Enzyme design. Structure first.
Site, PDB file in Angstrom:
ATOM      1  CG  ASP A 149     -11.973 -21.983  29.027  1.00 29.50           C
ATOM      2  OD1 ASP A 149     -10.831 -22.431  28.748  1.00 29.50           O
ATOM      3  OD2 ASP A 149     -12.433 -21.405  30.066  1.00 29.50           O
ATOM      4  CB  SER A 198       4.811 -32.732  27.678  1.00 29.34           C
ATOM      5  OG  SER A 198       5.880 -32.121  26.688  1.00 29.34           O
TER       6      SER A 198
END
Length: 330
Positions: free
Chosen positions: A35, A199
């Site tokens: 994770d 992004s």
């Protein structure tokens, strides 16, 4: 040193990925969910409430000659999905794919929430976010990666998740055979303890690319892609009959649909998620309503590049003194 381990989807939808991890002496192999969104290595154990264990493999510290109680240390964690676990702590030898750390904090669960009990395929979590999020009290502990880092050939690990197929986690090296083209690196903020990055924009199917900054985390422990409501509405508007269902808890679409791809930007580079990756199948057995893999991050307070996005790429988690993320096509 380096390590290399295969990661396998737990079911036919890629709901999560499990990676075998050796704990203790002699080795006890547990299948852990790696994770990048959390920083605790915790396991089902001989200490876990018996009614909360249903088919998991347990760690038994009393059977490990290298286990030592970390006296007075406790832990307690709550995840974004409402799940939780807590317990006490041992130090022990932990090996992933041939890479060994001595004195790793292994957080033994005394209690786990219902979603963990109900998932017999996940024996615990191995956190790979920054150690500043580790929940051990009163002495915060280091992640497996942070403990390994100094011994690694290069202070990196890579995630190469498969679509309906096994993939790979590598530690300490970048497999130049595992991706196509070049890796594009992008800046990371560690301010929230995550692999947080920006992004450069998105496109839906064959549509024009929208240049827009989208801050989010690279999170291998989250199944889906969670993005702002504007972006997610733009995607599902291209699927006839798709809608957001408050009863189901997100966007659903007719199972007869062909889904468009979704592109996200990494600097001037582009990662394309094929439409098939966004199909999470019937909402209930036999239903003709299917659950979407791109969902709104509204209410969650962060955008999450979960497995739907990461499995389209070869991802480099660069833990050099200035951390960066790398993405390549594959």
């Amino acid at each position: 040193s380096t390590g290399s381990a295969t990661t396998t989807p737990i079911d036919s939808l890629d709901d999560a990925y499990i990676t075998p991890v050796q704990i203790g002496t002699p080795a006890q192999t547990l299948n852990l969910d790696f994770d990048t969104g959390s920083s605790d290595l915790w396991v089902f154990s001989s200490e876990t409430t018996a009614s909360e264990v249903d088919g998991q493999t347990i760690y038994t510290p009393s059977k490990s000659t290298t286990a030592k109680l970390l006296s007075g240390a406790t832990w307690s964690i709550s995840y974004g999905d409402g799940s939780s676990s807590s317990g006490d702590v041992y130090t022990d030898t932990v090996s992933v794919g041939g890479l060994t750390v001595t004195g790793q904090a292994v957080e033994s669960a005394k209690k786990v929430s219902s979603s963990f009990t109900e998932d017999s395929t996940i024996d615990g979590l191995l956190g790979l976010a920054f150690s500043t999020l580790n929940t051990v009290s009163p002495t915060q502990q280091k992640t497996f990666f942070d403990n390994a880092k100094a011994s690694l050939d290069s202070p990196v690990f890579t995630a190469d998740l498969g679509y309906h197929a096994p993939g790979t986690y590598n530690f300490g090296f970048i497999d130049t055979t595992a991706y196509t083209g070049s890796i594009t690196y992008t800046a990371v903020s560690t301010k929230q303890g995550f692999w947080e990055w920006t992004s450069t924009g998105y496109a839906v199917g064959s549509g024009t690319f929208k240049s827009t900054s989208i801050d989010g985390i690279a999170d291998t422990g989250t199944t889906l892609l969670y993005l702002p409501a504007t972006v997610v509405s733009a995607y599902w508007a291209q699927v006839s009959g798709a809608k957001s269902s408050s009863s189901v808890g997100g966007y659903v679409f007719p199972c007869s649909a062909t889904l468009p791809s979704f592109t996200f930007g990494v600097g001037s580079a582009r990662i394309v998620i094929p439409g098939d990756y966004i199909d999470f199948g019937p909402i209930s057995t036999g239903s003709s309503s299917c659950f979407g893999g791109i969902q709104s991050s509204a209410g969650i307070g962060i955008n999450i590049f979960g497995d739907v996005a990461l499995k389209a790429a070869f991802v480099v988690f660069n833990g050099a003194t200035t951390p960066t993320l790398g993405f390549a096509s594959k």
